[PDB]
């Protein structure tokens, strides 16, 4: 089908997706957009719930604008702001290490981004470099690290009672193993702490080039998650974060948060801004990838 909604032309498949993602164009405004498609026959629908989480988030810094949700042939479609490459794309472009300055510019932003999500009574639960995208130059947000992919989010404040969700265990594992928190591996209900811990793992991935549990395989997914969690538990923070004392402090702090506890986001930002200033860095958005040829759908 040629169109989604009144005004969005459906274009080519984009990204490296299987038809899940297309370029689109708002014919009414002469603007490109991203079109996410999900078959109506899906045995595990996620797109409509994702749209509802975007409505709960509302308009925010580093959150893509969402323009439409509705049918498109035999698909449900969500039309959203077209962003730039992901941090994983950019990491590859930068030979799979980022400088401390780039990691800190990312980290300072992403602590705030997670604070925003948490302020809207949601936990994110899908931290990975693929889900953080820079903007496009055309919208003056190419410097801003955005967060996408809210299909795995959850409301952590129950809306009627206004109580934090209860602690429980035996939660099935499905996420991304590489970044997930130790408590996620143990089958615990995720909470605010776990989003911040997964961010810490991702920051160390960027700094080191890899994480020491990244290569582990097993005959079953469950066994693989187990081995990865075992390695996370067996790798001292002082070792993982050798040469990055503030990252060690960050990770120890988030690992030690209680399930119900509100993180001190101010404290975590200050760890990193104090470090940033002490190193003489200037917060000028000159990330490692500036000056390189970025992948673009057009
Ligand atoms: C490297 O090629 C591309 C670079 C940037 C790009 N922009 C996007 N903007 C979005 N809002 C996107 C998404 O919502 C999205 C949707 C699905 C998806 O599946 C892996 C990945 C990203 S991709 C899409 C493709
Ligand atoms: Cl445009
Ligand atoms: Cl920010
Ligand atoms: Cl991995
Ligand atoms: Cl600098
Ligand atoms: Mg915006
Ligand atoms: Mg995903």
UniProtKB/Swiss-Prot annotation:
<dbReference type="GO" id="GO:0036211">
    <property type="term" value="P:protein modification process"/>
</dbReference>
<feature type="active site" description="Proton acceptor">
    <location>
        <position position="126"/>
    </location>
</feature>
<feature type="domain" description="Protein kinase">
    <location>
        <begin position="8"/>
        <end position="277"/>
    </location>
</feature>
<dbReference type="GO" id="GO:0004674">
    <property type="term" value="F:protein serine/threonine kinase activity"/>
</dbReference>
<dbReference type="GO" id="GO:0006897">
    <property type="term" value="P:endocytosis"/>
</dbReference>
<dbReference type="GO" id="GO:0106310">
    <property type="term" value="F:protein serine kinase activity"/>
</dbReference>
<keyword id="KW-0808">Transferase</keyword>
<comment type="subunit">
    <text>Monomer.</text>
</comment>
<keyword id="KW-0723">Serine/threonine-protein kinase</keyword>
<keyword id="KW-0067">ATP-binding</keyword>
<protein>
    <recommendedName>
        <fullName>Casein kinase I isoform gamma-3</fullName>
        <ecNumber>2.7.11.1</ecNumber>
    </recommendedName>
</protein>
<feature type="binding site">
    <location>
        <position position="36"/>
    </location>
    <ligand>
        <name>ATP</name>
    </ligand>
</feature>
<dbReference type="GO" id="GO:0005524">
    <property type="term" value="F:ATP binding"/>
</dbReference>
<keyword id="KW-0007">Acetylation</keyword>
<dbReference type="GO" id="GO:0005634">
    <property type="term" value="C:nucleus"/>
</dbReference>
<feature type="binding site">
    <location>
        <begin position="14"/>
        <end position="21"/>
    </location>
    <ligand>
        <name>ATP</name>
    </ligand>
</feature>
<dbReference type="GO" id="GO:0005737">
    <property type="term" value="C:cytoplasm"/>
</dbReference>
<comment type="function">
    <text>Serine/threonine-protein kinase. Casein kinases are operationally defined by their preferential utilization of acidic proteins such as caseins as substrates. It can phosphorylate a large number of proteins. Participates in Wnt signaling. Regulates fast synaptic transmission mediated by glutamate.</text>
</comment>
<keyword id="KW-0597">Phosphoprotein</keyword>
<comment type="similarity">
    <text>Belongs to the protein kinase superfamily. CK1 Ser/Thr protein kinase family. Casein kinase I subfamily.</text>
</comment>
<keyword id="KW-0879">Wnt signaling pathway</keyword>
<dbReference type="GO" id="GO:0090263">
    <property type="term" value="P:positive regulation of canonical Wnt signaling pathway"/>
</dbReference>
<keyword id="KW-0963">Cytoplasm</keyword>
<dbReference type="GO" id="GO:0016055">
    <property type="term" value="P:Wnt signaling pathway"/>
</dbReference>
<dbReference type="GO" id="GO:0005886">
    <property type="term" value="C:plasma membrane"/>
</dbReference>
<dbReference type="GO" id="GO:0004672">
    <property type="term" value="F:protein kinase activity"/>
</dbReference>
<dbReference type="GO" id="GO:0007165">
    <property type="term" value="P:signal transduction"/>
</dbReference>
<keyword id="KW-0547">Nucleotide-binding</keyword>
<keyword id="KW-0418">Kinase</keyword>
